[PDB]
Design a protein around this nucleic acid. Sequence first.
RNA 1: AAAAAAAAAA
Length: 726
Amino acid sequence: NLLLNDYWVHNEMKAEIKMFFETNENKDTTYQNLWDAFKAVCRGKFIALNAYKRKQEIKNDKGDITTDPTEIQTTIREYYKHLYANKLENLEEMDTFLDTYTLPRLNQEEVESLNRPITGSEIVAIINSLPTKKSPGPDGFTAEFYQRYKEELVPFLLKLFQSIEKEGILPNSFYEASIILIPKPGRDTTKKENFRPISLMNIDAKILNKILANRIQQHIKKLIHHDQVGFIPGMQGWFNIRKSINVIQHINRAKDKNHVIISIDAEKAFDKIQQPFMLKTLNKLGIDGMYLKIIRAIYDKPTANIILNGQKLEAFPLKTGTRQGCPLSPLLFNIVLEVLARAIRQEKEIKGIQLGKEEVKLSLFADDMIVYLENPIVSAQNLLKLISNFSKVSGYKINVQKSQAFLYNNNRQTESQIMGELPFTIASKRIKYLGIQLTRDVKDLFKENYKPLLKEIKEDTNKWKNIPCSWVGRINIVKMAILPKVIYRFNAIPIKLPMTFFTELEKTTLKFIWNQKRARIAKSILSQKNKAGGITLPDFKLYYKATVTKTAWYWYQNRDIDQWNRTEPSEIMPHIYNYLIFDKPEKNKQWGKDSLLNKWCWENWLAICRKLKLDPFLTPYTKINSRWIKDLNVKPKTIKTLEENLGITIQDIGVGKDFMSKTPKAMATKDKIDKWDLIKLKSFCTAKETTIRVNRQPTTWEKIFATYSSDKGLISRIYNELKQIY
RNA sequence: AAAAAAAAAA
């Protein structure tokens, strides 16, 4: 990195790049070996430049405790290679499972989009969007190499990529990788299976599959189901938590408790899937041409070298298991699990939980898959056989030791047959999920999710006390260490939190920032913006308030990829959860009791807007399909007529004296609109009140809840907005 | 200490 910032070295390497390749332009060889030789000559040149600058300036198989550096090499290497070398040869048996069920088929245009030749725009975007301060596959290189030498490799990489077009093979240096062993959180180091494989590959290799990932990233939503939320941009991890928690609330209210909840976690699923399976599934869903050709060469014979205690252990062929840390690998992880997800979904012998008209049966993540079952006498047994059959074709062995379950039964005699037969660790109190605890009882959801939470900072704040640093150095780590983690809890679990709860949370922080001393500056002044002299002190009371309103956005957009919002129980007339925000309010209809995470949002949604002195039921950002127009008898087809034309807001449609007539294309639309609809709609905005309500400039608050579809920093806008009003 | 989750911290 330091050598990469030298102007003389930069010019020398620019000259070497310019007059190196055009010295042996021979047709006898290929471009991959020339590429590797260019890497080697770059390594030699950097070695020479560094020299010039320096001149100028655990338990074994028997269970015994072993500490010998030579002995441990023979154990972990054998254990890793034993699992990695086991490649399934039952190719004919493998295809039978795939033909049993159905997988999506990509349209030719999408395949052509994946088969589209790499342009000069993808190269610049990926290299620009390359995070720094990281370590790739060694190569004697670093990440800053391609972020500084962009100009000479912008056309050159296409030439390197053009070689793949006529060959479909990868360079020998592309296959190398560096698996880094890091311990799992809160696990003993004595067991050889408690380490995490972190394989770092070449930046050039890391680039290559990224477009392969990026090309399928634009099509991943069509491929996999919406149930999986792992590593899918536009989808958040807490989706399952809210989805899952609603089930226990349903199970608690349900008098007939005979359903079972299991959190199936797999032991190192990142490395125990079969390359033949993942290659043929990629063939089975319509992918072919270059995409099938290039993906075959990527995993034709991948290998990785182990590094431990400063030893460059020799590499070995990864016969099975996708490479860890590859950006494309998680996308492939979903697909191999996707057919698994469909297999359980399409298995009608095992039934899912029917929440009204919504069918909820299972959920996925990276490793912590959860399946909801009822009548475990048959359904649970039917679950095991499919996984073993999937394991028989993929090596997907479920970690029954580390995976718990939740049993809800009314007869103790029936319960005895579960632990006796089902080998799952039936935990009757709580289970682990990404740091959250799905309590058996909803009344205990507050206790086991926040009482451990409040004491978590109690000893955490009991550590950063003796550091000789200023009071300014206390608030920043609060926003860095504890603040990011807590909002995960509110986002996953927005229960009505008593004011007493925030007392300990605030007071613990208060003694931390001043180091067990009285406040030197006013809290209100310090809570203001930097412009007014403040530091923007975190306010968890509003952060909880903001996070309760964070989910208020999803009702407006009503994306079909979110199902958890429809899981709330309702013993009365069906879903209205789409026509609530920015719509006419329904009278003589109040939610509560069974509803836990929706009514509180509405109670908090109305509270904030009333303080703003705003009418939320009629806004410029009102949806065209809002119930305000559905109050009277209207034709559903009529909304579809202008859905393709304007589609977004009633305001753009026209109001006042501009009934569906404000823009030239509307003149070509009114003919399509039914004439009984015109008289119905011409009376809608005739009233003066209806005009002023919409004919107004939208404020900042309504902006974020309509625009800003890339909902990544919704907290920042809402919390800042709540700071000003409150 | 990598793919992806995130608070923006400017």
